[PDB]
Amino acid sequence: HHQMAEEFVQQRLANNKVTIFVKYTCPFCRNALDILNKFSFKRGAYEIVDIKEFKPENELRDYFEQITGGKTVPRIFFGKTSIGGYSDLLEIDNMDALGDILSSIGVLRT
């Protein structure tokens, strides 16, 4: 009668994969996606997850808070590890560390 938010999130994560959880309209979502969309990924190594597929929204917010420290999208995962949100990603990009991190975690098409 009820999928748990924890299962919804964790089923979509993998060790060598970037997963970003978004909503259709979320302006930091687009901004985040634009960063990631600069790169070409291996097959199955990048997934954009529409959180409107999960109800109730508050259960998924509460779970994101427990494992990422924030409630609202975008929520970005490099492997099974939470990176946080848009300004977290922007910070990595601005330091020019993002390409190296993406290389290390095995997601880039070469």
> Domains of the chain, with CATH numbers?
1-110 (3.40.30.10)
CB neighbourhood size of 48 (10 A): 15
In the sheet with 75-78, reading across from the earlier edge strand, the strands are 46-50, 18-22, 75-78, 81-84
Query: CA dihedral in degrees (22, 27, 31, 37; nearest 10)?
Result: 40
- 58, containing H or E segment: helix 57-68
- End-to-end Cα, the chain, rounded Å: 43
* Nominal resolution (angstroms): 1.8
What is d(CA 83, CA 5) in angstroms, rounded to the nearest whole number? 18
Burial class (CB in 10 A: 0-12, 13-18, 19+), 63: buried
Q: Where are the alpha helices (DSSP H) in the chain?
A: 5-10, 27-36, 57-68, 86-94, 98-104
Token pair of 23, please?
């909503």
d(CA 17, CA 33): 15
Structural method: X-ray
